[PDB]
Design an enzyme around this catalytic site. Sequence first.
Site, mmCIF file in Angstrom:
data_model
loop_
_atom_site.group_PDB
_atom_site.id
_atom_site.type_symbol
_atom_site.label_atom_id
_atom_site.label_comp_id
_atom_site.label_asym_id
_atom_site.label_seq_id
_atom_site.Cartn_x
_atom_site.Cartn_y
_atom_site.Cartn_z
ATOM 1 N N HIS A 75 6.158 -19.268 -5.312
ATOM 2 C CA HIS A 75 7.238 -18.715 -4.497
ATOM 3 C C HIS A 75 6.873 -17.391 -3.883
ATOM 4 C CE1 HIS A 75 8.825 -16.575 -8.130
ATOM 5 N NE2 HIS A 75 9.277 -15.716 -7.232
ATOM 6 N N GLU A 123 -4.368 -0.529 -9.099
ATOM 7 C CA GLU A 123 -3.257 0.401 -8.882
ATOM 8 C C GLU A 123 -2.601 0.738 -10.229
ATOM 9 O OE1 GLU A 123 -1.327 1.858 -5.613
ATOM 10 O OE2 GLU A 123 -1.603 2.946 -7.505
ATOM 11 N N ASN A 162 0.070 4.026 -10.281
ATOM 12 C CA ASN A 162 1.238 4.647 -9.678
ATOM 13 C C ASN A 162 1.183 4.541 -8.152
ATOM 14 O OD1 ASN A 162 3.471 6.162 -9.071
ATOM 15 N ND2 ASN A 162 2.817 8.000 -10.244
ATOM 16 N N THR A 222 1.445 7.818 -5.870
ATOM 17 C CA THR A 222 0.424 8.853 -5.837
ATOM 18 C C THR A 222 -0.959 8.346 -5.508
ATOM 19 O OG1 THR A 222 0.112 8.763 -8.292
ATOM 20 C CG2 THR A 222 1.759 10.280 -7.438
ATOM 21 N N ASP A 246 -4.492 8.935 -8.936
ATOM 22 C CA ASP A 246 -3.571 8.776 -10.059
ATOM 23 C C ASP A 246 -4.067 9.584 -11.225
ATOM 24 O OD1 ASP A 246 -2.023 7.099 -8.617
ATOM 25 O OD2 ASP A 246 -2.704 5.236 -9.517
ATOM 26 N N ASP A 260 5.650 -23.895 -10.305
ATOM 27 C CA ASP A 260 5.696 -22.640 -9.541
ATOM 28 C C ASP A 260 4.420 -21.854 -9.862
ATOM 29 O OD1 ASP A 260 6.486 -20.547 -7.906
ATOM 30 O OD2 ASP A 260 8.182 -19.916 -9.130
ATOM 31 N N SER A 270 7.907 -10.920 -9.615
ATOM 32 C CA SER A 270 7.746 -12.341 -9.308
ATOM 33 C C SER A 270 6.231 -12.647 -9.294
ATOM 34 C CB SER A 270 8.379 -12.658 -7.956
ATOM 35 O OG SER A 270 9.774 -12.936 -8.105
HETATM 36 CA CA LIG Z 1 -1.927 5.236 -6.979
#
Ligand SMILES: [Ca+2]
Length: 276
Positions: free
Chosen positions: A66, A86, A88, A91, A94, A131, A226
Amino acid sequence: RNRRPELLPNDCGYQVEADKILNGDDTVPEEFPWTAMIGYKNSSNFEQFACGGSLINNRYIVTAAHCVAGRVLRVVGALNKVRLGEWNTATDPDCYGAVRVCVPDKPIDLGIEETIQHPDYVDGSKDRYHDIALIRLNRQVEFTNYIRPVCLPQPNEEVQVGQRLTVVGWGRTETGQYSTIKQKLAVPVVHAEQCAKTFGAAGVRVRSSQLCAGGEKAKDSCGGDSGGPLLAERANQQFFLEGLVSFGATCGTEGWPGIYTKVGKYRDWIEGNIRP
Ligand SMILES: [Ca+2]
Ligand SMILES: *[C@@H]1O[C@H](CO)[C@@H](O)[C@H](O)[C@H]1NC(C)=O
């Protein structure tokens, strides 16, 4: 079916232990380095991250079907990129902790070479059976302390009711908060009957390939994305992708646990749709 089980690495599910100062439900950047953010782009070029996924090897992430078809595509935008490493999103760089340190590596945004939805998934369906989808990334990913693959269960392995798992993400669901720091929340697996309301439609039966987790005793644990991971920590702190978010949990008065795609149940299909 061209199964390539050896393309799923045995060095999987391990994260660096480098833990630090005062938390919350916040992670450190080294925790759950298989998390991915799925980015969309609409027709006037506005972009946003609106789904999650899990890195499974140096070329693929696994997410919900989905996340790659239907509602998200009209509401948010076309499927555009996948972000790895990743922590944060507010920022860059990080940096964390009383005795301060910064992630040396900028997050990487990768293109999408192809998307493979499960053949038996039906876009817009009440049940969202099957799904699951694979995204082949544009480039081979080099693993680091902040980007690493998660292990996948075998099709014969079962989570038990009462077993505690960890959902991880940035609140990227229909009813989520859209947090900037990656969050981790502990949730119990519950009897399938408790997900009666989760579908937002009456009479849908929870299939064998779906997992019900969250609920009355986990009202502080709504989050995840999701398509995002639900993890078991197995022996030797090795993490396995027991589920991904198909219908998000809701933690209010009249809410419900989440329905997750049982990822082990699609191991064979995964192996038959990955290439070096
Ligand atoms: Ca970051
Ligand atoms: C793209 O998204 C932005 C921000 O949500 C919105 O202002 C814009 O109308 C969208 N583009 C169109 C017209 O589809």
